[PDB]
Design an enzyme around this catalytic site. Structure first.
Site, mmCIF file in Angstrom:
data_model
loop_
_atom_site.group_PDB
_atom_site.id
_atom_site.type_symbol
_atom_site.label_atom_id
_atom_site.label_comp_id
_atom_site.label_asym_id
_atom_site.label_seq_id
_atom_site.Cartn_x
_atom_site.Cartn_y
_atom_site.Cartn_z
ATOM 1 C CG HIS A 52 -2.055 -0.882 1.194
ATOM 2 N ND1 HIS A 52 -3.325 -0.819 2.014
ATOM 3 C CD2 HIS A 52 -2.340 -1.886 0.315
ATOM 4 C CE1 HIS A 52 -4.170 -1.965 1.708
ATOM 5 N NE2 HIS A 52 -3.862 -2.562 0.402
ATOM 6 C CD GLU A 54 -2.077 4.311 3.515
ATOM 7 O OE1 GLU A 54 -1.554 3.846 2.252
ATOM 8 O OE2 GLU A 54 -2.842 4.241 4.119
ATOM 9 C CB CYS A 82 -5.901 -0.555 5.499
ATOM 10 S SG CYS A 82 -4.162 -1.241 5.192
ATOM 11 C CB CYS A 85 -1.388 1.324 5.996
ATOM 12 S SG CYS A 85 -1.092 0.526 4.475
#
Ligand SMILES: O=c1[nH]c(=O)c2ncn([C@@H]3O[C@H](CO)[C@@H](O)[C@H]3O)c2[nH]1
Ligand SMILES: [Zn+2]
Ligand SMILES: [Zn+2]
Lengths: 157, 157
Positions: A52, A54, A82, A85
């Site tokens: 992801h 991040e 999420c 993350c």
């Protein structure tokens, strides 16, 4: 300066979904007005479901700064991080998180209802150390509109 | 079969501590009795706070199978996965997690009180559906013993 780096994360989301690296998600890690890493979701490019925006930004910032902690740094996420993350942000010792769009804006166009209890303060075991700022006003509007814009772009494809 | 792969994860934890790669944590991803990935914590070697054993194993399994989902694979973790790693297990769609030691075993020797609500059944916004088995008997014994044996032999993070 919050507006500047949040809009840069939004730009990263647009760039990443245009070049096919991954979904429309961006993240920017800053060190006292100095950009350390500017990344987007790389799940498709890296064949990595953990890549992801991040997590990618954390990895790149940690390698660039030769340290596993980012205590002097803040992270700007185009969309609400999420659970994975948010846990990565906790582990990275980032001192502040600013995110643009609520997770519901991503869920509206088909992404999983994968929301971090510790970010929203709904957990029993996990709490957040982090200073968390949810963006409002113009930055929030830009970030929120990211997902409907991307769906429009690929509608007739 | 569970004890064999959990023991291999424990062995990975020991090997990683002995290498200086990171903390005493291992993770083995299996597809129908075939080991797809066998990893330990790589935080110190990679200068990457997201490089936990479980995340590293997911990355390697996805690269080996060249796919971003592991729907038919299972993961064995020497210690209860943290919020980040459990989120990564969610995102990789692993169908089963077997873990050896409770997170308190790691917390007792200096690691963060950083526990995943969705794993222990107290998640609200994070809804995991994968099968979760906490090891008993000899598996729990060796997994817990990991943290007694590796005290003072690695740098915390
Ligand atoms: O899931 C995990 N994988 C690891 O490699 C790891 N290395 C350290 N820790 C920490 O151990 C505690 C129990 O999960 C938490 O503070 C983790 O961050 C880890 N958690
Ligand atoms: Zn995420
Ligand atoms: Zn972890």
């Amino acid at each position: 300066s919050d507006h500047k780096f949040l809009t840069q994360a939004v730009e990263e989301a647009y760039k990443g979904v245009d070049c096919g690296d991954g979904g429309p998600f961006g993240a920017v890690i800053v060190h006292n007005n100095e950009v350390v890493a500017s990344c987007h979701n790389m799940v498709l490019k890296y064949t990595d479901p953990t890549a992801h925006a991040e997590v990618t930004a954390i990895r790149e910032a940690c390698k660039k700064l030769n340290k596993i902690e980012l205590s002097e740094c803040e992270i700007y996420a185009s969309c609400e991080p999420c659970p994975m993350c948010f846990g990565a942000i906790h582990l990275s010792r980032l001192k502040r998180l600013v995110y643009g769009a609520k997770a519901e804006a991503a869920i509206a166009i088909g992404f999983d209802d994968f929301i971090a209890d510790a970010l929203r303060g709904t957990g029993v075991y996990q709490k957040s150390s982090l200073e968390i700022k949810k963006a409002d006003g113009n930055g929030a509007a830009i970030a929120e509109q990211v997902f409907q814009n991307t769906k429009e772009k690929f509608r007739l494809y």
